[PDB]
Symmetry: C4
Subunit: 313 residues, 4 copies
C-alpha cells in the first residue's frame, strides 16, 4: 500500500506466435526501460507457440547482461492465464502489461512511470482517433458507463493492453481465483486512486461472435441486476391482465354484452396474469442463483492499510 | 461461553466522512466508558473517508493516556465489512457497536453493560416514538415476526445500530464468510439468551429503492420457503384446469352442446393444466438451488460448551 | 475396516427435555451394557434443554464408578447435529444410537452386538405390528424401494432410531459435511454388508407438514432423476402438437375446410409445441444444477481396505 | 513434462467379477511387459467383487518374483473411481490402462510404448471394422467432432479402454476433483502432443438408457453452449410475433377488416412475443448457472514447464 516513489519496474508480455515481431519488440522495449534510470526486468511468457518463438526467448535470456526472464507453458491456455503466470513471478514495485504485436508503442512506458510517481495506484490509457465503427463505438460508451457506476472508476478503453499496476493491486488479484473475469475491472475494485491518459497507436485493420460472447462476460462480472428486472417485468404484466379482466367483467354488467368474442377475451386476460407470475418465479430463483455466484468467487472483503495503537505510556 | 461478570468492554465504531461529529463523539463516548469502572478500548475504523477524518483519528490515538485504536482501510468497502475488520482486532469480553453520527446517545452504554451482567448473550435496543411512515412501520412488524419464527428471538428494530455482543458470539460470526447477511440476525442464530430494552434517539429527518433491495436480502438470509410456494401454487392451478376439462366433457354429453365456443373453452382448460405444471417444475429446481446455497455459506453446525468425563477412580 | 470381534461399545443418546424419562433410561441402559461382557461407555448430549435435564446428566457422570460422558451444547441445534457431536467424541469399536423416550427398549442392545460379531457393518431394526395409517404405510414402502435401488441396501423402517454402526462407517460420515441428509442413508453408501432384524416397541399415539418436508429431503438426497423427467415430458408434448398441426394442414387440403374454428385450432397446436420446448429448457438447466449439488457436497469417492505389495525377494 | 525415453511402465487394470479371465490376463499381460526390456509393474484394483477375484489377486502378488500390486476397495464404487485409486499408487513414467475382459489384446502394449518414445504425451487407439449399428456409429462421429472443436485433439473411439498417459498428465488429473467427467477428455485438456493408432479387438455381441445418460455427461463436460441457444431461439420468436402484430394492425387500417377472427389472431401474436421473452429469461439464468459450475470444478489454469533466469554475471 506504499505511495513511495517507484524503485523497480516489471514488464509482463504474453507471447503467442510472434516470431517476426520479437526482434523489434525486445530492442525497443529494452531501450525505453534503460531511459527510466531505475532497475527493471522484462518477463516473456510463451503460451504454447509453434513458430520458433520459444527458441528466441531462451536465446535472449542467455544473452550477456540480459534483464529478460522467460516463462514457458506446456501448452496454450489463454492470454489471461499467461498474464497471471507472469504476476506470480514478478519482483518489482510497478507492474506494466504490454502487447507483443507492437500496436502499443513501448515508448509510452516512461509516461506511465512518471504518472504513477504522483501517487496513482492504477494508470490506464485511451487510444485517440481510432475511428471504429458506430456499433463498436456505441458499445464502448455503454461499457464505460456500466463500469463507472459499479466500480466508481471510469474506463475509456477496456480493450487497451497498455496499463500500469502497483504491487499491492497485483497481490490481491492473485487472491481472486474466479475463472471468468477481466483484469482491468478487477484492479479498480481494489484501487483507491486511478487515472487515464491519452496515447497513440498503429492504424487498425475480435470477430462479431467473439464480441457478443464478451458482452455476457462483462455483465456477469459486474452486476446481477438483470435477474432483478424479471420480477419487475412480471409485475407489470400481471397487474395489466388483472385490471383488464375486472374492466371486462364490470363493463358488461353495467353495459350489457358488446362483442361475440367477449368470453374469449376474458380467458386471454386471465392467461396474461399467469404469464407475468412466471417471470416473478424465475426472478425469485435468480435472487438465490446470483448470491451463490458471489460466494463461489470468494473475493477479498477488505484490506487494512495500517493500525495505530495508543502509546504504552 | 462464559456467564461471568464483564471485565473489559470494546466499542466498535465505523467512520465514513464524520469530520464534524468526531470531536463530540470522542468526548462523550470516552466519558461514558470511564464511568463503567472497567477496562475499556475504543476502535475507530475509517472506510476510505475523504474529509480529513483519518487525520483526526491518528491524532486521537497518539494523545496522552489514550484508549483509542485506529484501523485504516485502503478504500471504501462498506459498513458491514468495516465492522468485521473491528471484530478481528477486539480484545475485550463485551463488544458494543455504535454509530458515529450521534443518533444513538453514547450515554446508554452503561445500561447495556448492566443488562449483560445478568447473563444475557445479546442485548438489543428499540427506539421509542420515532413516528415513522405507515409503510415503513408495517414493514418493520412483518420483519420482526419473520425473524421471531426463524431464529426463536424477536427484534423490534432491526435497523438500530446500538447493540451488545459477548465474545463467544463474535468469534463464531467470524467463522461465517457469507457475503450477503445481516449481523443482528446472525447473532441470534448462536445466542442462547437475548433481550431488548427501550432507548431514545435524535429526531428523524435508506431511500425507497434501497429499502426494496434490503427486503430480498432479509428473506434470502432467513428462509427458502418462497421456493416451496411455487409447487403449491401450481398444483392448485393444475387441479382446477383438469376438473373444468372433465366437467365440460361430461356436461356436454349429458346435456348436449350449449355454446358456440365450447371447443375453444376446452382447449384453454388443457392449457391452464400445463401452465400449473410449469410452476411445479420451477419449484422442483428451487429445492436443489436452495440447498446449494446453504452448503456454500457453510455456517457452523454446533458449538460445545463443556464436556464432563467420569472420574478416573 | 476390521471384521474382528467387538471389544468396546459406545452408545449415543440425544437429549432434549427428558427430565421424567432419564432416571429410568440410565438404569435400564446401564444394566443391558453390563450384560455384554465388554467395555462400554454411554454418551448423553443435551440439545439446549430447559427442564433440568443438564443438571441430572452432570450428576450421573460424577457418580462413583460411572461410564457416562456428558456433552452440553450452548443451545438447541437439532437431533442430527447432536448425534454428530457424539460421533466426534466416541472411543469404541461399535456405535449404537438410541432414543431417550424409551420407545425402543434398551434390552435389544445385546442382540445387535451379537449380529455385528458375525461380520455385518450396519445392523438395522424393523418395528413389528405398529399398525400405522394407510397413507403413512404406503409412503414407507415407496421409500424402501427407492433406497434399495439407489444404495443397493434395503431399509424397512427409515424412521427407527435403534441402529448399530462399526467405527469405519462413522469416521467417513464425519467426512461428509452436507447440511441436508439422513444418517441411515449415508451409512449404506459406504457399507459392504448390512442386515435388519425385527424388534418390538411401545404403542404409538411428525405432523403432516413435517412429513411432506421430509419427502423432499429424501428425494434430493437420493437421486436427481426428477430433473430428467422434465425433458422427457416436454418431448412428448412437443411431438404431439407438431403431429396434430401437420394433420390439420394435410387434412383440410385433401378434404376441404371442415370447421369454423379450424384456424384457431392450428394456432393452439403451434402453442402446445412451444409449451413442450419450455419443459426441455428447464430440464436442460437441471442437468447443470444437479451436478453442481454433488460437487458442493463433496462426498468421498472411495476407501481403500489394504494394499499388497510383492515380496522384496 | 519430460520428453525423455521411457524407463518404467505402469499398467492399471480395474477388476470386477473377472474370476474366469484373470488366469489368462495375468499370463498374457506379464509376457508382453517382459518383452519391453524395461522395468514394469502391474496394478490390479478390485471394485468390491463377489466371485473370489480378490483371493486370486492376493495369491498372484505373493507369488515368487512377482511384479503385481493388489489394491482392494471396501465396496463397489465404479470403474472411474477404481482407476483413480490406481493413479494414486503408480510409480512409473508411462501409465497404460487396460481392460480385464481381454477385449483389447495385451499384445498391443509394445506398440504404444514405442509411439510414446517419439515424444507424444497421450497415445490412443481406434478399433477397426467393429461394424456397429448406424445409430451408434453416427453418435460416435458427432462426439468426435465435438471433442475436436473444444479440446483441439481428436478422439476416434471415446469408448476404447486401451490408452497411454505420461506421468505429468496423470498428476494433474489427480488435481481435478470433479465427480462427473471422462478421463480421456480430461487428458487432452492438458496434453501438448497427441496421436491415435489402429488396433484390432474381439468380436462384439451399454444399454440404450445408459447411452442417453452418457450423452448428457459428455455435453456438460465439454461446453455450456446449449444454455446460450435459449436466448437466440427466444429472440427469433419474439421478433416474429412483434412483426406479425404490426402487420395485422397496419394491414387492417389500410385494407379494412378481412376476417371474423381478426381480433383473436392479434391476441395470439402478442402471446408469442411473451413466450419468446421467457426463453431469454431462462438463458439469462443459464449464463450464471454455467459459470458457477466451472468455478466449482476448479480445474488448474496453467502449468509451467521451465523458467529461464538471466545469468548472474
Amino acid at each position: 500500500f506504499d505511495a513511495a516513489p517507484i524503485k523497480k519496474v516489471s514488464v509482463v508480455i504474453p507471447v503467442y506466435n510472434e516470431q517476426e515481431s520479437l526482434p523489434e519488440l525486445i530492442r525497443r522495449t529494452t531501450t525505453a526501460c534503460e531511459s527510466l534510470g531505475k532497475a527493471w526486468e522484462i518477463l516473456l511468457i510463451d503460451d504454447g507457440s509453434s513458430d520458433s518463438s520459444a527458441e528466441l526467448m531462451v536465446k535472449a535470456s542467455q544473452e550477456a547482461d540480459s534483464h529478460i526472464i522467460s516463462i514457458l507453458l506446456n501448452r496454450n491456455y489463454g492470454q489471461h492465464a499467461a498474464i497471471m503466470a507472469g504476476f506470480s513471478h514478478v519482483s518489482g514495485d510497478l507492474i506494466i502489461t504490454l502487447d507483443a504485436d507492437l500496436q502499443n508503442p513501448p515508448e509510452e512506458i516512461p509516461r506511465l512511470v512518471a504518472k504513477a510517481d504522483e501517487g496513482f495506484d492504477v494508470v490506464g490509457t485511451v487510444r485517440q482517433n481510432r475511428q471504429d465503427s458506430l456499433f463498436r463505438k456505441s458499445a464502448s460508451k455503454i461499457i464505460n458507463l456500466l463500469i463507472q457506476r459499479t466500480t466508481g472508476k471510469a474506463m475509456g478503453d477496456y480493450g487497451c493492453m497498455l496499463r500500469a499496476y502497483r504491487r499491492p493491486i497485483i497481490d490481491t488479484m492473485l487472491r481472486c481465483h474466479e475463472r471468468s473475469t477481466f483484469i482491468p475491472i478487477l484492479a479498480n475494485i481494489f484501487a483507491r486512486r486511478a487515472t487515464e491518459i491519452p496515447v497513440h497507436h498503429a492504424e487498425r485493420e475480435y470477430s462479431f461472435m467473439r464480441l457478443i460472447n464478451l458482452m455476457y462476460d462483462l455483465v456477469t462480472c459486474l452486476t446481477t441486476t438483470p435477474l432483478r428486472l424479471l420480477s419487475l417485468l412480471g409485475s407489470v404484466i400481471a397487474i395489466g391482465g388483472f385490471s383488464l379482466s375486472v374492466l371486462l367483467i364490470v363493463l358488461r354488467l353495467a353495459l350489457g354484452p358488446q362483442w361475440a368474442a367477449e368470453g374469449v377475451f376474458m380467458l386471454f386476460a386471465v392467461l396474461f396474469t399467469f404469464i407475468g407470475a412466471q417471470f416473478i418465479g424465475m426472478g425469485l430463483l435468480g435472487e438465490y442463483i446470483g448470491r451463490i455466484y458471489n460466494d463461489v468467487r470468494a473475493r477479498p472483503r477488505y484490506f487494512v492499510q495500517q493500525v495505530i495503537y495508543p502509546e504504552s505510556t
